[PDB]
Symmetry: D2
């Protein structure tokens, strides 16, 4: 079993299966892929769609006429395969002009160029049917303390996103923005380094309803944070617009392993949350097939992303459906966590002698939470020992 | 030089110099301090004031009459010394009843008790003149994925803070709340683990203007994050209500070293930011004298906190005042970062051929940022080699 | 299935199920256990044996006569249950006298006391039949750079272990020593912080054959290291004398979760290695039932340790036995890794034009390693999807 | 002041100032440097010498005749400047053929090629006068557990180093080997990941006296370890043959900042140790000028490396020479740490009732260590406040 179909909404970036394997210490180990061949191969594996940076699809520097030819060939492969394009993004990190950032570069003329390069691709994204436009400010940041006044940089970041929201509103486009946090790499520290920082920043934009987050498994784990907790907070705020799925082994460089590798139990709890909460966006894989692999390994790695999601989906569903787990959840008072603390209101709480004066603190303290039995039931389900 | 006076607004928690040195592997190495003696000794060192948890000042379980005696003796030492109490907080972590949290415990009766214990201390804090009430949800969190539904927990957390804001508004108190994030320890993962997560959560409260953050140097460094960057974002949002100063050597257990130890360059850039931005709140030290020390070492460690702040203040001021640094800041285009990207507006930007069609991307890319020369000037200033 | 029996050699420290739940921020949540009751309960769960620190079994300060009574009652419970005692250790960390270390304390009289306290327990360990004596130098280390000259400290550490080896040799005891590394906590940095540092240090002892390592899953993961790789290096050196099994979620305080929690894939590869290499020592759990739990949760957590080991043992065995995995291992050239690079010798290698002058570097470079297919077969086996 | 001269023995790799700024997310920002121009510029700054990989000096694939021309031009620049070449190394990581390692690649023919490529450069290194040959096994490792049997890989690693020792012995060369550890990047985990693992491995080689370590500041800090402690252990073992100096901000990708940046207090304690212990090898900088910089920034960054070493040398010397620090060191019993624990021997220790039966454990426990006063004196010296 565990066969994906387009209805599972699995998507991949062109830059994922197309990563040629150049890393900071080594040359490329694979030839470049034509975007048309990636679309065709991914469709055969059961993917729903692809995503792109402007510069993945149109080589930097292309003339308007080469640009039209590149888009036309791409559109033909989408039509031939039934593949969709649900998200697009801008490359504001590879070209040397962006070495100190795009939206927050110290040079004003670079910031203006960054905005114009972005706006050009938003038009293209809308034409291809994308619903989400992602921004990853990978060069926005610093290696040293005096290089960047962060309050001024956040003013420039707000200014840029405000202008993009003005642009989409005045064009009447039906597209929303998602900010993708990352704590470091390639800059020593990156601005808006976690889900939380990005959520807080969105609330200071002029039109906050147009902006959400695009969290990545590996990025929050590069700060040692619990990725399902961060996703829960994004869902609670109503801001999970898109998600990047992959694997990471702890606090180190961004590995972008296939989804399911890295922290397997966190992948289980993530899938449990996304499915329980009814997340209906794309399940997007931002991963790199390791540079040890040839092209057969690339497609095996991509297939593995989808397979692991579907296995974990089955295990999480079996967990939540198990009557014994339902009993254990009540034993651990998960039902009580969902009930208001004081629906009776402040005055009733202040007048309630059972909440303080007569509260038996020692009897409450002696109650075990039964969390270890619950967690072993979850382990047994994950391993198929139930 | 480097002598503190009460005008520098240095404050200390009772639990800092009073830490008896019990750690998870060892017994206490120091006897308990009477709060009155800590107030007297800190005043002699030049401190401005002290802070407290309810249970530092009034032993848990005290009768209303013992409670009055404890507060009266404390007030007498404040009157005798001129020491202030600018901040107070609640202990919702030591007693076993709080083993699964206070505001987000799964048991509803514990959550109600947590709120009543808090409200009782807010009254006391106002009576002693505190302007900020800190909340550190050290037990709010989980060791395993099924133990805590985080969306329900955030509902309970919002409910608790909303009720506290209703309480202070209806009493007419002039006190604000500050949430203190920490990513982990003593729970495996703690809810609202960073400055950013706390800032985002505040924007969903019913009266957000009453709530800010109380960031701690060491806590953001336990996630590998840049503490001055996080403080800059808190200042940008207008939410830096209080701060906890200490030192930490990287990603490990919360060390709470004296301020200046740990990451010294980050301490320099923090002081530079606080002084430049005109932060006028207390400079509060949340630190633990190591359990190797006797009481003479306790007071040396506390004195060192203040000394290091004043040395770094002098060095940061000399840095910003140095004409050569002013020249270097312009060389690195810090002045241009502070200028709007597009004060001319969206349409002018779209019509500006110098922002895209005629932009010379190769010439812009060749401009060096001169950040390494600027950073060596900052190093020279820090080390007193300028 | 997955029922342990004494033949699986699962052992537990008295301090594990007996941890009362005191952490740096909270009081104990469980009453103390009598060592006799822990022995009885563990035997009912299928354990093979228990381990102890001197101070777990004999309260610190006991008279020689109380000491005999404590040992006699303990021996009676071992006789009644059939439980063995394969390992023992000394507590050189809890008492305040050890605040700057035992073997490497700066005070010479403390170092002498530490040695005498150790020697007294080696006699007891031999009397109870222990084959391994573990040393965990949890207080050997420093919070600041000038407090400890590390070369002098390593001289003192070598001196102490040399004297212990002289003691066991002159008494004719059949016991070996195992050093347990940990990188930090409770000291800011601990001497011999990893498996590698401990292995290197052993080679400078006077009788290296008497000393090996006792690595702990969570400790190597507190440095972000790969625990199965470190165990492989300890096996390669012939020095894996004992092992501590538990779980840890990344780089943070020492969590001591039950085995199987934390990094589940690393637990799978660890079990694969131990079973393949024929490790025949005790499978020892050094874990803490979380302080959320009552005593029913303690025993569930302990049972879970053993269960997870036996599930992973089954999955790793099914992986290695699967013909398709055998085919994939050959596809990835694991067979070639096991063959000597140059059994023909140096001169033949220098004369072999196919190794350099005529080596087709581009054809070799194009060969994919097929590691992603192999790793997905391992995932499928772990999850029971094969 | 703080002007370097060739007598300070500062050296730089050709690949450091010559790094073109290509990172995993971006193109090069600087043109390639001719090795002859780097030698000339470094000599003007006061450097002592340069180091190289084979492929930095001779482009991969060069004919024997182009090879001679490249070496001749290089030798002429050394003669013209007086620059020395104290260390050389092999590039076994950039070419795609090395994607699964050099000495421990699964393919046997790649391992043989790796050895031949190394041996060819050892001859060249000896001809240029290098005394140390460094090996950094950056590709030796794995992203997944089944890809590499680590015991077989360590057999292949021992085999390769044994063959290199046979080669240098039979040629009569006066060159020693130094292994450079790194825990990860570019492989997910790298074999011999820390100083300790490398020291332990050397003791299993056939001729251990020919092998030492070349530790790098940033690499040990990528595992959160204390770099001066690791250097002390390497000095204690007599194995510090060479050192790589740079800066790193905590646990993240390898930043290779200029020396003095990153953890400044650790740089102070490192310099204190190297100078106190009389390390007489090269002070080698393995650093990357950030890709924000133009060539003027490159040379400023290199100059900063040397400047910061000389400032810290002055501060550490003033610390050790200060009578008040000498008094504090005795107060903290550093003198007693240097005295044998039991020069009187085992029997005398066992017979000494003052070591146990009559030892006053409470009085010893009450003695403070005075480490915080000592550490503030060290801070005051570092900051020039003494
Ligand atoms: O912006 C989309 C993608 O851009 C870059 O490739 C980043 O490395 C990746 O994290 C991000 O998701
Ligand atoms: O709530 C005030 C203090 O409470 C606890 O002591 C925490 O450990 C500390 O971080 C916090 O600042
Ligand atoms: O020495 C045996 C045990 O001692 C202490 O309890 C440590 O916390 C543990 O890691 C170690 O294994
Ligand atoms: O081998 C010498 C150098 O090789 C590589 O460039 C590594 O990145 C560096 O760490 C090492 O020191
Ligand atoms: Mg990533
Ligand atoms: Mg990414
Ligand atoms: Mg991404
Ligand atoms: Mg803290
Ligand atoms: Mg704290
Ligand atoms: Mg605090
Ligand atoms: Mg542990
Ligand atoms: Mg442990
Ligand atoms: Mg242990
Ligand atoms: Mg490096
Ligand atoms: Mg390096
Ligand atoms: Mg190096």
């Amino acid at each position: 079993n565990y066969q994906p179909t387009p209805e599972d909404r699995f998507t991949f970036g062109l830059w994922t299966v197309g990563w040629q394997g150049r890393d900071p210490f080594g040359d490329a180990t694979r030839r470049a892929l034509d975007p048309v061949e990636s679309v065709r191969r991914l469709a055969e594996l059961g993917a729903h769609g692809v995503t792109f940076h402007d510069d993945d699809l149109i080589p930097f520097g292309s003339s308007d006429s080469e640009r039209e030819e590149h888009v036309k060939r791409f559109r033909q492969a989408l039509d031939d395969t039934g593949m969709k394009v649900p998200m697009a993004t801008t490359n504001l990190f590879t070209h040397p002009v962006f070495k100190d950032g795009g939206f927050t570069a110290n040079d004003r003329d670079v910031r203006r160029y960054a905005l114009r390069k972005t706006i050009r691709n938003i038009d293209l994204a809308v034409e291809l049917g994308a619903e989400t436009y992602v921004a990853w400010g990978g060069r926005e940041g610093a290696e040293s303390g005096g290089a960047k006044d962060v309050r001024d940089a956040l003013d420039r970041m707000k200014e840029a996103f405000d202008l993009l929201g003005e642009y989409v509103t005045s064009q009447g486009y039906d597209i929303r923005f998602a900010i993708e946090p990352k704590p470091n790499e390639p800059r020593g520290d990156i601005l808006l380094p976690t889900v939380g920082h990005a959520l807080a920043f969105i609330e200071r934009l002029e039109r906050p309803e147009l902006y959400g987050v695009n969290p990545e498994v590996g990025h929050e784990q590069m700060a040692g944070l619990n990725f399902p907790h961060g996703i829960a907070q994004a869902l609670w705020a109503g801001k999970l617009f898109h998600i990047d799925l992959n694997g990471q082994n702890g606090i180190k460089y961004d590995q972008d392993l296939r989804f399911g590798a890295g922290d397997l139990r966190a992948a289980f709890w993530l899938v449990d949350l996304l499915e329980s909460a009814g997340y209906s966006g794309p399940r997007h894989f931002d991963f790199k097939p390791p540079r040890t692999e040839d092209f057969d390994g690339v497609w095996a790695s991509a297939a593995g992303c989808m397979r692991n999601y579907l296995i974990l989906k089955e295990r999480a569903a079996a967990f939540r459906a198990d009557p014994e787990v339902q009993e254990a959840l009540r034993a651990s008072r998960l039902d009580e966590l969902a009930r208001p603390t004081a629906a009776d209101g402040l005055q009733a709480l202040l007048d309630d002698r059972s909440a303080f004066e007569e509260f038996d603190v020692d009897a409450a303290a002696a109650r075990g939470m039964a969390f270890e039995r619950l967690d072993q039931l979850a382990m047994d389900h994950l391993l198929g020992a139930r």
